[PDB]
Design a protein around this nucleic acid. Structure first.
Lengths: 137, 42, 140, 383, 250
RNA sequence: AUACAGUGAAACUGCGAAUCAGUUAUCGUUUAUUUGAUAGCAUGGUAUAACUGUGGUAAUUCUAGAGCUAAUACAUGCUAAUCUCGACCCUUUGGAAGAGAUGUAUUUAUUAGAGUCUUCGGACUCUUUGAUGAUUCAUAAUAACUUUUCGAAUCGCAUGGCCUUGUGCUGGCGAUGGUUCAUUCAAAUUUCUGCCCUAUCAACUUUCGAUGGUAGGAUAGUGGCCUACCAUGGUUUCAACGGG
């Protein structure tokens, strides 16, 4: 796709030279916001836009990198992961079944599968409630 | 009122501006000397 | 939040606004002129705003023609015409060239008048031209 | 006298001591006298006077010079106080241009509402001179780059009229008609540099048409001749010499820009006068441009080599020998590439030209290039 | 606007009234810098109370590292010198065995320079390079071989640099913080992670290594040549039991 | 001390007026103050305070009237001048005719910001920039927009020098101000855990925002903090939701 909205989607200020000839018309902007990853081929030769993504959008990653299992993908560009971590209680002195909800903005770099494990880090706050961003599934 | 002191202070402001510039743009050149030394080194 | 601004066209009149932590912001109202820029070889000029044709979120602004960010324009073409025929020696892209004797150009606003108080246009050229003519076809 | 001027500006009984009114308007006095006298002349009526035409003429000259704000506003009030028929449709433009809120697009728009009457031309030229009198440090720059670019929306006759208006105070054709100029005034010499800056500004704003006016071009030549006159009339206390070096560099770079920008329908058949002035500029040291940034000397020589018409006034003097000498210096700078391109352009535009003088210049150029183009060791750009 | 939760290396008792001196804004952080009031009143006892501390500051008398700075709560902290013309003294004030601020007594030719770990380096404006060290000495025009976590020798009379010091294996380092505070030595190995928790590791006579984060430590110098005379005879703080054992031996 | 010179009431100006707990990031914000760097007209006008007076009013720290006069209060406003290439000389460590170059604040568009040869000593050319883990980072150039920002109309102590004794030109210490950057001190948000009892609380949130994505507005900014447009989500027997 190229549009889903009345407005236009475009990488801001990374434009081509609109006089001379190049076979891209927009230099798709490379970035990596850290964490030692190699840049993805979908970002080098991709087609989406995603201003909340950490590979073309202008948001940065650092801080709290955590993991979990994907259970919910039904929203728009944001998936909910399951940090299924066991807790401890001073009453029982045993272990118990616990998990919390963590939503994370999915990126269309690689596909959005229901069930995989992701490695997501703390970003500048993309929305009202979601705080992290997908850097790698 | 124009005093002997007021144009003295105006003269001192002139002297301070010209002295600050005549130190700054020369310290630029003494930095460029070390940069030229390292450029001949590498 | 604070009050809306909804700045219009003609008769430049700007509120003086001090905000949180210095940062003097220019709440411009009723913008009359605009600095625009050739996006492929870089010449800018103050240029007289005529009207706003497109709004990318609400056709209330296509009705009332309120100046904001990201609203496609048709503005003046005459100072770009005078430079285009006064320094060239030619006195003339092809679909940009088609917008010469129509008396109107096409561009877009990025600077917020309720925040910065400026008025910026970049002359769209290429796939911007193609998508925005398709948006003119989407309206019409 | 300041109390007398204030009392005569308060008690408004005009046409009672109006005997030396136009003589005082044509005479000189201080600025504290000039402001009160212009306030009195704006408080009067000027319909029937000793000479109402002379009063309007002094008002136009005051709004021309004006020191860019105050007498401009006072003379605009005087011009509205005169017989201002067909000007109430431009009184808003006059008040805006005299005011410090002179949005130049707004002034040229209110005059474009007052257009098809042509009764705003003298006021617009005086407003252009007022906006051109801005002086020094980046506010004057932001105003001057606005003014010289915004005055391009005007008539094709009125642009040459404003150029002649700049020409008027420092034309000096009666001074330079006999041999050259002999009187040196630094205050008028600075106005020559102001005319040079305004002409370069107008040429850079509109470098296709450029609007040639012949007396203005000859006055620019007279200013360059006064620069060479001061250089031969060295004033070695040398504030005048520094001013003359500031005038001649910008003057040569401006005179090269007019020819090299118009180059088709300008530079009329009287090119021998400009060739004589260039011969006077080369007779000091023809090879004084051996640098790579050789400004306007190599540009005029290369433009005369490029445009095939100018070879006649080129070969009038021996100037191709001068360009070949500056090219054939031993340790010549990176302008040697422009000199070789000049040899390429002057081979098929002088050796394919009229045989009497242009082929003679081409023969001299080929004789220079046979025994003087030996060290071809340009080890830089292979292009 | 108040205090008494002061950093306990200030030798501050509890029954000295309630409030402690709040360090005003200056070169250093509050947690690792002592003010001139807690110096001149209850660190070397040249004064008795704040009134006469104000007297001996506005007597044009004190000169923290080249200049007067009449301010009681002035945070002259680590690696500075405090000269006084009367009492002949110069105090480079550094860390020590236990963690508090040891005074020195420094002569003039060692008192006419300090040194500074660089905190960051950039290009300031108009092409000019840009160096700032730990006390806010934003200094233009270094030598171009600039690293970060790196020691520059500040001339301290005129505020330029007089000498440059790199950092690698086999040249001294001195810790400012952590549990191992005020300790020297640099000879094990130069390990680096990413994301911190790395140190230039620390020698001992028994090869005892102390590894902290690299923001705390910085170079003094090299073997045989440190640029500061060191407190209490090069204090490495072996042991109280080893001290009593050496007491029983010799 | 015939401008002023000591103290100096009054007044203006300047400055200052569920605690949640541990807990990371601010490459998402501003950063007053301190501290350190940092910017080539013998000096003009308001519009007034204290005060002098006229009163009202039971009265208030109530006041109106007119006469006054101050600025670091308000509002305007300025001086060629230096760095490159320097052919030639006369030897230079120069002085030179002149071909030249010229700040800052806001906004947008960019663009850059990636194996021989030997005087065995020496040379013979090799690559442009500051980094973090990471950038549209730091920084430089053009184009104009600026309801046009700043680039000192300020003060205290001495007041020394150059000699062409002008009444010239210079010159010290430091008080305030002021552009930008950094520091320091802060704020305002943000990542991870927790506390009162409950299934005689099992469903809770898209009522008139619920939860996302796209644009716009608000923002000091990341950000439904809101607007429209696209999607119909999200939470939960894990003790959620509600109540004590």
């Amino acid at each position: 796709t190229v549009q889903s909205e009345r407005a236009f989607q475009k990488q801001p200020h990374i434009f081509n030279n609109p006089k001379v000839k190049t076979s891209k018309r927009t230099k798709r902007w490379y970035k990596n916001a850290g964490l030692g990853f190699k840049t993805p081929k979908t970002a080098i030769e991709g087609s989406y836009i995603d201003k909340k993504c950490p590979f073309t959008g202008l948001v940065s990653i650092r801080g709290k990198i955590l993991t979990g299992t994907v259970v919910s993908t039904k929203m728009h560009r944001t998936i909910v992961i399951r940090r299924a971590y066991l807790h401890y209680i001073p009453k029982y002195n045993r272990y118990e079944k616990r998990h919390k909800n963590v939503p994370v903005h999915v990126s269309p770099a690689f596909r959005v599968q229901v069930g995989d494990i992701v490695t997501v880090g703390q970003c500048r706050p993309i929305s009202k409630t979601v705080r992290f961003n997908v850097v790698k599934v | 009122l124009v005093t002997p002191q007021r144009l003295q202070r105006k003269r001192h402001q002139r002297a301070l501006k010209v002295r600050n510039a005549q130190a700054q743009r020369e310290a630029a050149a003494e930095y460029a000397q070390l940069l030229a030394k390292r450029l001949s080194e590498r | 939040g604070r009050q809306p601004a909804n700045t219009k066209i003609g008769a430049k009149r700007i509120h003086s606004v001090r905000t949180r932590g210095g940062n003097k912001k220019y709440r411009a109202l009723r913008i009359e002129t605009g600095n625009f820029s050739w996006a492929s070889e870089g010449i800018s000029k103050k240029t007289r705003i005529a009207g706003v044709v497109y709004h990318p979120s609400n056709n209330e602004l296509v009705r009332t023609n309120t100046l904001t960010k990201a609203a496609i324009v048709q503005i003046d073409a005459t100072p770009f015409r005078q430079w285009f025929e006064a320094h060239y020696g030619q006195t003339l892209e092809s679909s940009v060239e088609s917008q010469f004797s129509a008396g109107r150009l096409y561009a877009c606003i990025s600077s917020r008048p309720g925040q910065s108080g400026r008025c910026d246009g970049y002359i769209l050229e290429g796939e911007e031209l193609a998508f925005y003519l398709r948006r003119l076809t989407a309206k019409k | 006298t300041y109390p007398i001027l204030i009392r005569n500006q308060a008690l408004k009984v005009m046409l009672s001591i109006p005997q030396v009114a136009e003589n005082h308007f044509v005479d000189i006095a201080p600025f504290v006298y000039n402001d009160f006298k212009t306030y009195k002349d704006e408080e009067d009526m000027e319909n029937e006077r000793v000479i109402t035409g002379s009063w309007t003429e002094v008002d136009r000259n005051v709004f021309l010079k004006t020191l860019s704000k105050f007498k401009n506003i006072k003379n605009v009030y005087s011009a509205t106080e005169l017989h201002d028929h067909l000007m109430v449709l431009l009184g808003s433009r006059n008040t805006d241009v005299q005011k410090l809120a002179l949005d130049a697009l707004l002034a040229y728009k209110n005059p474009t509402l007052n257009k098809y009457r042509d009764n705003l031309k003298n006021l617009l030229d005086d407003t252009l001179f007022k906006d051109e009198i801005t002086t020094f440090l980046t506010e004057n720059g932001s105003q001057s780059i606005k003014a010289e670019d915004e005055k391009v929306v005007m008539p094709y006759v009125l642009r040459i009229f404003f150029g002649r208006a700049q020409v008027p105070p420092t034309s000096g054709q009666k001074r330079s008609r006999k041999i050259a100029v002999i009187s040196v005034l630094p205050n008028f010499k600075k106005p020559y540099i102001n005319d040079f800056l305004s002409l370069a500004s107008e040429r850079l704003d509109y470098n296709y048409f450029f609007g040639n006016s012949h007396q203005i071009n000859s006055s620019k030549a007279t200013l360059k001749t006064i620069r060479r006159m001061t250089g031969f009339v060295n004033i070695v206390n040398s504030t005048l010499s520094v001013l003359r070096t500031n005038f001649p560099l910008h003057t040569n770079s401006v005179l090269q820009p007019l020819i090299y920008s118009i180059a088709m329908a300008y530079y009329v058949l009287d090119t021998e006068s400009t060739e004589e002035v260039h011969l006077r500029k080369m007779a000091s040291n023809l090879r004084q441009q051996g640098l790579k940034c050789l400004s306007s000397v190599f540009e005029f020589v290369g433009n005369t080599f490029d445009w095939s018409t100018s070879m006649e006034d080129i070969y009038a003097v021996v100037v191709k020998p001068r360009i070949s000498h500056f090219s054939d210096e031993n340790l010549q700078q990176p302008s040697s590439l422009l000199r070789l391109f000049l040899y390429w352009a002057h081979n098929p535009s002088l050796y394919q030209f009229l045989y009497y003088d242009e082929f003679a210049t081409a023969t001299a150029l080929m004789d220079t290039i046979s025994n003087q183009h030996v060290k071809e060791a340009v080890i830089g750009p292979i292009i | 606007l108040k205090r008494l939760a002061a950093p306990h290396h200030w030798l501050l008792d509890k029954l000295s009234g309630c409030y402690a001196p709040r360090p005003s804004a200056g070169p250093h952080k509050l947690r690792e810098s002592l003010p001139l009031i807690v110096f001149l009143r209850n660190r070397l006892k040249y004064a008795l109370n704040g009134r006469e501390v104000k007297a001996i500051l506005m007597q044009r008398h004190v000169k923290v590292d080249g200049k007067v700075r009449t301010d009681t709560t002035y945070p002259a902290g680590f690696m500075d010198v405090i000269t006084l013309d009367a009492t002949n003294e110069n105090f480079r004030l550094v860390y020590d065995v236990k963690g508090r601020f040891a005074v020195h007594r420094i002569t003039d030719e060692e008192a006419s320079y300090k040194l500074g770990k660089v905190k960051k380096v950039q290009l300031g404006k108009k092409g000019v390079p840009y160096v700032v060290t730990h006390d806010g000495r934003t200094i233009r025009y270094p030598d171009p071989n600039i690293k970060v976590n790196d020691t520059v020798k500040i001339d301290l009379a005129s505020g330029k640099i007089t000498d440059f010091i790199k950092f690698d294996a086999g040249k001294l380092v001195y810790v400012t913080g952590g549990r191992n505070l005020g300790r020297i030595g640099t000879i094990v190995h130069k390990e680096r992670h990413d994301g911190g928790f790395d140190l230039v590791h620390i020698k001992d006579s028994l090869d005892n290594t102390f590894v902290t984060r690299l923001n705390n430590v910085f170079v003094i110098g090299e073997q045989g040549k440190p640029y500061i005379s060191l407190p209490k005879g090069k204090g490495i703080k072996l042991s109280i039991a080893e001290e009593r054992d050496r007491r029983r031996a010799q």
